[PDB]
Amino acid sequence: PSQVRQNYHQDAEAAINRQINLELYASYVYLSMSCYFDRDDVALKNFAKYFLHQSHEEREHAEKLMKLQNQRGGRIFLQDIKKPDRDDWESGLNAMECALHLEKSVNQSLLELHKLATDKNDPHLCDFIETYYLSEQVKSIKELGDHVTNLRKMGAPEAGMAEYLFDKHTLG
Amino acid sequence: PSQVRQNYHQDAEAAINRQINLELYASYVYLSMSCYFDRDDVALKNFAKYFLHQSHEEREHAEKLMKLQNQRGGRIFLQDIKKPDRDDWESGLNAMECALHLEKSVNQSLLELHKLATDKNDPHLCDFIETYYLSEQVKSIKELGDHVTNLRKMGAPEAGMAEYLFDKHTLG
Amino acid sequence: PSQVRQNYHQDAEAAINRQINLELYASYVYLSMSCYFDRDDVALKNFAKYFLHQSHEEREHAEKLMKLQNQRGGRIFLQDIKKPDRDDWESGLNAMECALHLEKSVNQSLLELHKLATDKNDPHLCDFIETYYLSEQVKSIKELGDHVTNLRKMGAPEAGMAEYLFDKHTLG
Amino acid sequence: PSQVRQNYHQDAEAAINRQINLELYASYVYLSMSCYFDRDDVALKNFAKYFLHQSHEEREHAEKLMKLQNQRGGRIFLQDIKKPDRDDWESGLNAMECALHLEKSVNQSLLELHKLATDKNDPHLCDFIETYYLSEQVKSIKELGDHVTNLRKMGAPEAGMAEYLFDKHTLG
Numbered sequence: 001p002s003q004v005r006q007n008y009h010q011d012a013e014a015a016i017n018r019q020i021n022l023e024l025y026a027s028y029v030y031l032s033m034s035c036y037f038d039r040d041d042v043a044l045k046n047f048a049k050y051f052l053h054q055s056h057e058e059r060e061h062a063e064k065l066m067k068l069q070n071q072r073g074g075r076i077f078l079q080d081i082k083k084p085d086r087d088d089w090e091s092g093l094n095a096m097e098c099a100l101h102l103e104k105s106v107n108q109s110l111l112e113l114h115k116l117a118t119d120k121n122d123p124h125l126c127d128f129i130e131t132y133y134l135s136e137q138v139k140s141i142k143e144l145g146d147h148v149t150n151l152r153k154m155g156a157p158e159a160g161m162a163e164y165l166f167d168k169h170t171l172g
Numbered sequence: 173p174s175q176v177r178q179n180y181h182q183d184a185e186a187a188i189n190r191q192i193n194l195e196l197y198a199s200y201v202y203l204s205m206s207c208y209f210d211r212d213d214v215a216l217k218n219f220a221k222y223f224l225h226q227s228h229e230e231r232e233h234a235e236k237l238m239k240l241q242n243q244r245g246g247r248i249f250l251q252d253i254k255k256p257d258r259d260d261w262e263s264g265l266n267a268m269e270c271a272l273h274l275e276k277s278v279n280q281s282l283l284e285l286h287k288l289a290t291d292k293n294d295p296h297l298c299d300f301i302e303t304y305y306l307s308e309q310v311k312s313i314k315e316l317g318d319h320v321t322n323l324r325k326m327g328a329p330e331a332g333m334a335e336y337l338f339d340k341h342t343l344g
Numbered sequence: 345p346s347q348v349r350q351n352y353h354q355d356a357e358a359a360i361n362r363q364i365n366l367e368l369y370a371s372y373v374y375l376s377m378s379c380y381f382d383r384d385d386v387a388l389k390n391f392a393k394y395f396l397h398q399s400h401e402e403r404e405h406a407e408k409l410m411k412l413q414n415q416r417g418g419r420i421f422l423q424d425i426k427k428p429d430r431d432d433w434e435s436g437l438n439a440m441e442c443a444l445h446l447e448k449s450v451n452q453s454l455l456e457l458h459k460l461a462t463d464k465n466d467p468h469l470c471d472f473i474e475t476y477y478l479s480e481q482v483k484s485i486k487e488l489g490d491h492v493t494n495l496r497k498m499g500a501p502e503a504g505m506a507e508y509l510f511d512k513h514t515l516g
Numbered sequence: 517p518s519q520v521r522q523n524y525h526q527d528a529e530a531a532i533n534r535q536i537n538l539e540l541y542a543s544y545v546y547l548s549m550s551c552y553f554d555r556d557d558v559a560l561k562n563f564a565k566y567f568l569h570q571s572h573e574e575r576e577h578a579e580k581l582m583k584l585q586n587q588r589g590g591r592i593f594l595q596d597i598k599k600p601d602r603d604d605w606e607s608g609l610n611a612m613e614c615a616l617h618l619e620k621s622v623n624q625s626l627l628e629l630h631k632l633a634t635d636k637n638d639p640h641l642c643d644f645i646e647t648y649y650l651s652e653q654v655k656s657i658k659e660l661g662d663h664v665t666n667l668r669k670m671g672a673p674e675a676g677m678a679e680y681l682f683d684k685h686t687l688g
C-alpha cells in the first residue's frame with residue numbers, strides 16, 4: 001500500500017486507467033481528423049486547426065488523470081492506443097458528427113466513473129471529475145452539436161460553399 | 173396627495189403603470205427569443221445576443237418609467253408579466269417580424285400615452301415620452317424592418333446560408 | 345431527443361423551468377422593493393440601490409439557468425411572472441425581513457432541485473447547483489440576517505434615525 | 517418690430533419678463549436662507565452651501581431667460597426684486613419646506629408659461645421651457661421632498677442630532 005493512499009479503492013484505480021486510455025484514444029482520433037483536413041484534396045485549414053487543438057486538449061485531460069492517479073497513491077498502467085476507426089472522414093459535417101459521438105461516449109465513461117466513485121464513497125474523486133471533466137464535456141458536446149446544426153442548415157456537404165464559409169466564419 | 177405631486181393626473185399615472193407592464197412584457201418576449209436562438213438545433217449566437225440586448229434595454233425602459241412615476245408623486249402598481257405568445261419562434265426572420273410587430277405595438281401605446289398627456293396639459297410627461305421613448309422606438313422599428321428586408325432578400329428561412337451569413341455580418 | 349441530450353431526465357428539465365420562473369419572480373419582488381424606497385415619502389436611496397442590484401443579480405441567476413437548460417438539450421418553457429405580494433413594504437426592516445424570507449424559499453427550492461438531481465444520478469446538474477447557486481444563497485441569507493439584526497438593534501422602524509444611518513453607513 | 521422677431525407674441529414677452537423676476541426672487545430667497553444657516557446660533561455649514569448653490573442656479577435660470585428674450589427679439593423689462601418673506605427660517609426642516617413651496621410655485625408659473633406658448637402656437641418657446649426648465653424643476657421638487665421626508669423621519673427640528681447628521685451625511 002502506498003504511503004499516501006487513503007480512501008482510494010482498487011476499482012477506482014482501474015477505472016481511472018481505463019479513462020486515461022480513452023482520453024489518449026480521443027486525442028489520436030482528433031489527430032487523424034486534423035490530418036484529413038490538411039490533405040490537398042480537402043484543404044480546410046480551420047477544420048484542421050480545430051481538431052488539432054481538440055487533440056492537444058484531450059492529451060491534457062489524460063495527463064491530468066495521470067497526476068490524479070499518482071496523487072491518490074494508485075499506479076498508472078498504460079495500454080495500447082488503438083488506431084481510429086477510419087482514415088477518411090469524408091467531410092467537415094461527418095467529422096463533426098463523429099466528434100460529437102466520441103465526446104458523448106467519453107462523457108458516458110466519466111458518468112460511469114462518477115457513479116463508481118459515489119458507490120465507493122470517494123468524495124475527492126467525485127469532485128475532481130465534476131470540476132475538471134463533466135462541465136468541459138457538456139460544453140464541448142454543445143459546441144459540436146451547434147457546429148453540426150449550422151453545417152446541416154447551410155447544406156453541407158452537398159452545398160459546395162457551406163464547409164468553406166463555415167471554416168472562415170465560425171472556425172476562423 | 174404626495175407632497176411632490178403637481179399637474180399629474182390619475183389617468184396619466186394609470187397609463188404609466190400600464191406602460192411599465194408593457195415594457196416588462198417586451199423584455200420577457202425578447203428573453204424568450206434569445207433563449208430560442210441558443211438552442212442546439214438553432215445555434216445562432218449573434219441572434220441570441222441581439223435579442224438579449226433588446227431584453228435588457230426594455231428592462232431599462234421600464235425602470236426609467238418607474239423613476240418617472242416616483243419623480244411625479246405617483247405610485248407604481250405592478251401587475252403580472254404575461255408569458256410570451258410562443259416558445260418556438262421558428263426562424264430568425266420570423267423572430268425579427270414578431271419583434272417588429274411588438275415594437276410597433278409598444279410605439280402605439282406610447283403615442284396613446286402622449287395623446288393623453290397632451291389632453292391633460294402635462295408638458296413634462298409629453299417631453300419625457302418624446303425625448304426618451306418615441307425616437308428610440310422609431311430607430312428600433314427602422315432597424316428591425318431593415319433586418320427583415322435583408323433576410324427576406326437573402327432567401328431566409330428556406331435558403332440555408334441566409335440566416336448564418338446574416339448572423340455573421342450584420343449581427344456580428 | 346436533442347442531439348446533445350445525455351443523462352438529463354425530464355423531471356430535472358421541468359424543475360429547472362420552475363426554478364427559472366422562481367428566479368424571475370424574485371427579481372420582480374426586488375424591483376418592487378427598489379421602487380418603494382425611491383418614493384418621495386420613503387426616500388432611502390441606498391435601500392433602493394441595494395434591492396435594484398439584488399433584482400439584477402436574480403435576473404442573471406435566471407439567465408444562467410436558461411443557459412444550463414439549452415446546454416443539456418432541454419427546452420425552456422416560460423410561465424407568467426406573478427406580481428409581488430405587496431406594493432407597500434412599510435419599512436427598511438420589513439423589506440429586509442421579506443427579502444430574507446424570499447431568499448430562504450429560493451434556497452429551499454434549490455435544495456429540492458439538488459435532491460432530485462441526486463436521485464436521478466445527474467452529477468453535472470448537482471455540481472452546477474452547488475457551484476453557482478447554493479453558496480451564493482447562503483451568503484445572501486447571512487447578509488440579510490445581519491442587516492435585520494442591525495436594524496432591529498438600532499430600534500428600526502420606530503427609532504427615526506435608525507433606517508437613515510443604516511442607509512448611509514452599511515448600504516452606502 | 518425687431519429684425520429678428522418672428523412668431524413671438526407680446527403676451528409671451530411679458531410672461532417671460534414676469535418669469536425672469538420670479539427666478540431672481542427665488543435666488544434672493546435662497547440667499548437669505550443661506551445667510552440664516554451661517555449664523556453663529558444655527559451653524560449648519562452644509563445647509564448654507566446647499567441654499568447658496570440653489571441661489572446661484574436660479575440666477576443662471578434668470579440669465580438664460582434673458583438670453584431667450586434677446587434671441588427672440590423681445591425687450592427685457594426688469595422690476596424690483598422683492599425681499600423674502602422672512603429673515604428667520606427657524607430650522608433646516610422649515611427651510612426645506614419653504615423651498616419646496618417656492619419650487620412648486622415657480623413650477624406652476626412655468627406651466628402657465630408653457631400653456632400660453634401653446635395657445636400662441638410658439639413651438640420654440642414651448643420646447644425651450646420643456647428642455648431647460650420643467651425637468652429641472654421636477655428633479656428639484658423631488659429632491660426637496662426627499663430632504664423633508666428624511667428630516668421629519670429623523671425627528672427634526674426637536675431631535676437635536678437630526679439636522680446635524682443630515683447636514684453631514686446627505687448635504688455633506
Ligand SMILES: [Fe+3]
Nearest residue numbers: 509513681685
Ligand atoms: Fe453618524
Ligand SMILES: [Zn+2]
Nearest residue numbers: 023058061106
Ligand atoms: Zn477529455
Ligand SMILES: [Zn+2]
Nearest residue numbers: 195230233278
Ligand atoms: Zn421600450
Ligand SMILES: [Zn+2]
Nearest residue numbers: 367402405450
Ligand atoms: Zn437567485
Ligand SMILES: [Zn+2]
Nearest residue numbers: 539574577622
Ligand atoms: Zn429656476
